[PDB]
C-alpha cells in the first residue's frame, strides 16, 4: 500500500486555514493517522482513524476523509504550528508506510539577502588550507543560488552550503556557502567573488575581494 503526500512544502499565514492531502493507493476505510514533527523533536500523533483527536490535541486540528483521499486541516494557523506533517495508514497489514511529509512555512513579503564575503584568516592559511565564506543574510523566499568565481572561472564541486530554518520572529532564512581550496591553489589566483541570485534582486549581486 502506497501512501502519498503530493505537496512537500506549503506556505501559510498566521490566522489562516491550511489543508494537507494524503492519498492511499487502496481503500483503507478510515485507517489513516497524522503526525506533527517540529524541528529537533520526535513525531507526535495528532489524529487517528482520519478524524479522531488525541486527548489534549488543540481544537484547531481536524481531519476528514474516507476510502482513498484524506485531508488534514488547521482551522486557523498559529505560529507554533510550523512543522512537518506525516500521514500513515493503519488498516490491516504491514508494511505500515509513511507518506513523504509536508513542511509548513510562514509566508511573508519578498526580502533580498544581504551579502558578505570573508577571506581566509592568516591563522588558517598557515595550516595549509583556505576557506572562503559567502554569507546570505535574512532573505525570503528560501530559494537562492550562490556561484563562486575565481578569476571569473566558475567553480564546481569544491563548495558546500547550509541554510537556517525559518526565523520565528521575522520569517526569513539565511545561508552560508564555503569555498575550500588548497593553500597552493588559493595563492595562485587573485580575485575571489561570490555571485548571488535571488527573487528579491532584479540582477545577481556580486561581492568580491583581492587576495592582496
Amino acid at each position: 500500500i502506497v501512501v502519498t503526500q503530493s505537496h512537500k512544502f506549503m506556505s501559510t499565514s498566521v490566522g489562516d486555514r491550511v489543508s494537507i492531502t494524503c492519498k492511499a493507493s487502496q481503500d483503507v476505510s478510515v485507517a489513516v493517522a497524522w503526525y506533527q514533527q517540529k524541528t529537533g523533536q520526535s513525531p507526535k500523533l495528532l489524529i487517528y482513524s482520519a478524524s479522531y483527536r488525541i486527548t489534549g490535541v488543540p481544537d484547531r486540528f481536524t481531519g476528514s476523509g474516507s476510502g482513498t483521499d484524506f485531508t488534514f486541516t488547521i482551522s486557523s494557523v498559529q505560529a507554533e504550528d510550523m512543522a512537518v506533517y506525516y500521514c500513515q495508514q493503519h488498516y490491516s497489514t504491514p508494511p505500515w508506510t509513511f507518506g513523504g511529509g509536508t513542511k509548513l512555512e510562514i509566508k511573508r513579503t519578498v526580502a533580498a539577502p544581504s551579502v558578505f564575503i570573508f577571506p581566509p584568516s592568516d591563522e588558517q592559511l598557515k595550516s595549509g588550507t583556505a576557506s572562503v565564506v559567502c554569507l546570505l543574510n535574512n532573505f525570503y523566499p528560501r530559494e537562492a543560488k550562490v556561484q563562486w568565481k575565481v578569476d571569473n572561472a566558475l567553480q564546481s564541486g569544491n563548495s558546500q552550503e547550509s541554510v537556517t530554518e525559518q526565523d520565528s520572529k521575522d520569517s526569513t532564512y539565511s545561508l552560508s556557502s564555503t569555498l575550500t581550496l588548497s593553500k597552493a591553489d588559493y595563492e595562485k589566483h587573485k580575485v575571489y567573488a561570490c555571485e548571488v541570485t535571488h527573487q528579491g534582486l532584479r540582477s545577481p549581486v556580486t561581492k568580491s575581494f583581492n587576495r592582496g
Binding site: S42, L45, Y48, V84, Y86, T178, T180
Partner: protein, 217 residues
C-alpha cells in the same frame, strides 16, 4: 504516563553491529506491538519493522528484512533492534514507537542518533570571519572547522550577545569531519570599540576555544 526511553546517541565503526534499546513504562508492555522507524537528516520517516512482545511475531519492510533483528526482554519491558554490517548509509535517528490498540503510532521515544564513521574524535579549529573594512551594519563570525563527532556549541561574548546571531547546521566534509559557521550582524559604528569573541565548546573531545574576532589591518 506512557513513556518510551531511548539513549541519546551511539557512535560505531563501519562494519560493526549495534544494538539499540527502548525501555517502555506506564503500560502493559506485552499488550501492544513495538515499532521501529528510521529518519535520516532532513528526510522523511521510514518504517523499519515491528515486534509483538507477547508473541515474538515480527515483520519488516523489504529493505530491512536482511539488516535488522528485533528482540524483547519482557522482564525489563525493553525492546531492541540489532543492526549488522553497518555503513555510513545507516547513520540516522532511530525511533521506537508503540502501535496503538487500533493501530497508529500513538507514543514515540526521543530517538537514538546513530553515527557510523571511522573518523577519530577530534576538537575543532576556530577561525575568525573578519568584518569587512571598507557601515550601517556589518557582519562577522567564526568558522568552526574539522571536528568529530557532533555537536559543538557556539555562543558570543560568553552569553551577552544573542540578538542577530545565526549558527548554521554543520556540514560533513569529504574527510569525514564536520564544519560549521556562526555569524552575527552588528552596528559597524561599534567595530572599533566593541569586542566580539565566539566561544566554542566541543564536549566529545573536551575542547573549549575562545576566539576574538577583529577587523584586520
Amino acid at each position: 504516563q506512557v513513556q518510551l526511553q531511548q539513549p541519546g546517541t551511539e557512535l560505531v565503526k563501519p562494519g560493526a553491529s549495534v544494538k539499540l534499546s527502548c525501555k517502555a513504562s506506564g503500560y502493559t508492555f506485552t499488550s501492544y506491538w513495538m515499532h521501529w522507524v528510521k529518519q535520516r537528516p532532513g528526510q522523511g520517516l521510514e518504517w523499519i519493522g515491528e515486534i509483538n512482545p507477547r508473541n515474538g511475531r515480527t515483520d519488516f519492510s523489504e529493505k530491512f528484512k536482511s539488516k535488522a533483528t528485533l528482540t524483547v526482554d519482557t522482564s525489563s519491558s525493553t525492546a531492541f533492534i540489532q543492526l549488522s554490517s553497518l555503513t555510513s548509509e545507516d547513520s540516522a535517528v532511530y525511533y521506537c514507537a508503540r502501535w496503538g490498540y487500533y493501530g497508529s503510532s500513538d507514543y514515540w521515544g526521543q530517538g537514538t542518533a546513530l553515527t557510523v564513521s571511522s573518523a577519530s574524535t577530534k576538537g575543532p579549529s576556530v577561525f575568525p570571519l573578519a568584518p569587512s573594512s571598507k557601515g550601517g551594519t556589518a557582519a562577522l563570525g567564526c568558522l568552526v572547522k574539522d571536528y568529530f563527532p557532533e555537536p559543538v556549541t557556539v555562543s558570543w561574548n560568553s552569553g551577552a550577545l544573542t540578538s542577530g546571531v545565526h549558527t548554521f547546521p554543520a556540514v560533513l566534509q569529504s574527510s569525514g569531519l564536520y564544519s560549521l559557521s556562526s555569524v552575527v550582524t552588528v552596528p559597524s559604528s561599534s567595530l572599533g570599540t566593541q569586542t566580539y569573541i565566539c566561544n566554542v565548546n566541543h564536549k566529545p573531545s573536551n575542547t573549549k576555544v575562545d576566539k576574538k574576532v577583529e577587523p584586520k589591518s
